[PDB]
Amino acid sequence: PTTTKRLMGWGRTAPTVASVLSTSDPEVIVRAVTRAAEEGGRGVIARGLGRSYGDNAQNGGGLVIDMPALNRIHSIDSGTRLVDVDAGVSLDQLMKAALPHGLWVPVLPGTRQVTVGGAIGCDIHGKNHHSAGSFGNHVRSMELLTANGEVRHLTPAGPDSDLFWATVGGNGLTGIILRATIEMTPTETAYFIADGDVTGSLDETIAFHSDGSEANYTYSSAWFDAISKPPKLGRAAISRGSLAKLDQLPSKLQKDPLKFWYRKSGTYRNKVQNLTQFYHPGFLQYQFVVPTEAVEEFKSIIVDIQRSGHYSFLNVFKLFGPGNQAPLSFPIPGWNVCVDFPIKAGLHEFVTELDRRVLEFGGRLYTAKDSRTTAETFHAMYPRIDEWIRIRRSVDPDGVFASDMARRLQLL
Ligand SMILES: Cc1cc2nc3c(=O)[nH]c(=O)nc-3n(C[C@H](O)[C@H](O)[C@H](O)COP(=O)(O)OP(=O)(O)OC[C@H]3O[C@@H](n4cnc5c(N)ncnc54)[C@H](O)[C@@H]3O)c2cc1C
Numbered sequence: 001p002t003t004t005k006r007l008m009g010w011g012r013t014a015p016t017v018a019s020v021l022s023t024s025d026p027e028v029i030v031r032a033v034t035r036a037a038e039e040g041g042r043g044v045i046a047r048g049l050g051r052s053y054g055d056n057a058q059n060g061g062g063l064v065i066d067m068p069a070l071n072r073i074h075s076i077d078s079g080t081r082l083v084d085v086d087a088g089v090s091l092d093q094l095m096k097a098a099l100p101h102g103l104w105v106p107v108l109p110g111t112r113q114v115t116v117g118g119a120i121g122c123d124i125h126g127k128n129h130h131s132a133g134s135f136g137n138h139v140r141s142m143e144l145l146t147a148n149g150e151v152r153h154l155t156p157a158g159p160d161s162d163l164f165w166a167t168v169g170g171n172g173l174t175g176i177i178l179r180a181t182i183e184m185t186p187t188e189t190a191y192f193i194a195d196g197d198v199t200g201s202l203d204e205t206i207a208f209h210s211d212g213s214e215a216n217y218t219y220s221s222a223w224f225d226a227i228s229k230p231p232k233l234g235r236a237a238i239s240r241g242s243l244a245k246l247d248q249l250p251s252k253l254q255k256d257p258l259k260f261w262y263r264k265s266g267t268y269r270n271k272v273q274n275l276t277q278f279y280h281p282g283f284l285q286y287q288f289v290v291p292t293e294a295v296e297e298f299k300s301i302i303v304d305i306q307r308s309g310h311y312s313f314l315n316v317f318k319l320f321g322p323g324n325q326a327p328l329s330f331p332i333p334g335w336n337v338c339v340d341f342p343i344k345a346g347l348h349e350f351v352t353e354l355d356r357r358v359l360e361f362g363g364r365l366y367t368a369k370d371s372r373t374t375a376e377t378f379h380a381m382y383p384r385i386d387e388w389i390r391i392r393r394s395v396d397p398d399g400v401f402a403s404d405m406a407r408r409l410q411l412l
């Protein structure tokens with residue numbers, strides 16, 4: 001039942017207070033939206049598990065629908081590879097449910113604690129982006145509650161393709177997704193055949209990813225060094241691989257294939273690994289991508305980070321593949337970097353500086369990772385933003401759907 005609560009992003013900054021609804025009944029959500037439309041307060045926004053670091057899933061003064069309560073899985077079909085799920089279904093929940101059927105979650109982020117609705121809302125990406133694209137590429141259909149109380153059937157190629165692609169990466173600003181059909185990835189096992197490599201510099205890391213080699217693997221990411229001075233800066237521990245076939249597993253693991261003095265270094269070949277072993281090996285979360293061809297410019301950001309004295313120990317490096325049709329979708333082909341800055345004096349001035357260099361080089365920031373950037377910067381980082389706003393207003397003219405991010409980045 002609707003009640004006032006303090007809500008925060010994962011980064012635990014900029015708290016605001018809102019009214020919160022938690023229901024497993026789609027009809028209560030419809031009535032709440034229609035009621036909010038007829039009364040027109042500060043607005044409605046859907047919330048998933050709250051794994052975004054910023055302010056996209058909160059609406060100070062308004063209403064927030066806690067979506068995790070709406071978590072029924074309707075059907076799993078190995079033949080079509082299709083899965084019909086409530087937007088509040090967890091990726092962890094869906095994984096556990098679809099694995100015995102031989103189906104794999106097509107895009108897996110760093111944590112399995114995200115809703116389908118939040119996966120779509122931020123168009124999440126994973127280690128397999130260069131081969132699979134982002135989460136939006138794998139949504140066959142979705143049911144979207146709009147400001148007028150209508151539930152719209154949306155498809156990537158069909159009649160409402162425009163609303164579909166404005167919803168993907170739309171950060172809940174086109175309405176509340178109630179339900180989706182996801183096309184899962186077929187798999188024989190829950191294991192990876194993996195290669196490990198180590199490089200000695202930023203240049204080597206770049207070159208390693210630049211020789212067409214990435215096409216040999218479905219999944220690829222790397223940790224890199226952001227603390228050492230050149231020539232050691234950028235040296236990386238690269239982890240690449242693909243889902244194993246059954247005949248590639250040792251016999252001891254073939255029993256249960258879909259189950260949930262040596263020198264130890266980062267170089268190995270054709271290693272069989274489970275999900276934990278392949279993935280796993282306050283703080284300002286910062287993520288940016290610059291275009292592939294902007295190699296020297298990308299290098300300059302990494303160098304400047306190191307020179308700045310802001311020291312990040314947890315950094316992820318990935319080469320993104322082609323993007324998709326969503327105007328607000330974060331990934332573009334090019335160099336993606338996640339960095340974790342300990343909060344210190346001068347950090348905020350520095351990230352402001354980083355934002356503008358990313359802007360100049362043709363790059364963008366991720367909505368799931370931001371709480372600080374300015375509206376003029378963000379608009380400029382997404383060339384299709386005005387096209388998106390026009391679509392958003394067509395389905396929500398009176399601004400029934402709103403969030404702290406939407407007011408901050410002027411997305412209404
Ligand atoms: C440890 C960690 C690792 C991560 N790794 C990755 C990664 O590798 N790749 C990556 O892309 N992201 C990553 N993320 C970010 C995360 O995947 C996204 O922020 C995701 O959107 C969070 O899902 P959520 O269910 O918590 O949604 P929330 O954070 O609650 O909300 C996200 C947005 O989606 C909207 N939304 C949520 N549910 C609905 C719905 N039912 N209908 C309409 N709109 C909705 C909200 O309005 C909000 O704008 C990571 C986060 C953490 C904490």
Ligand SMILES: *N(O)c1cc(C(F)(F)F)cc2c(=O)nc(N3CCC4(CC3)OC[C@H](C)O4)sc12
Nearest residue numbers: 109110111125126127221287316317318336338
């Ligand atoms: N950046 O946040 C990031 C990018 C990618 C990639 F897909 F672009 F390559 C992948 C990625 C990832 O796989 N895991 C991340 N984690 C964040 C920190 C971590 C591990 C997972 O450490 C503990 C905490 C619970 O999560 S970030 C990431």
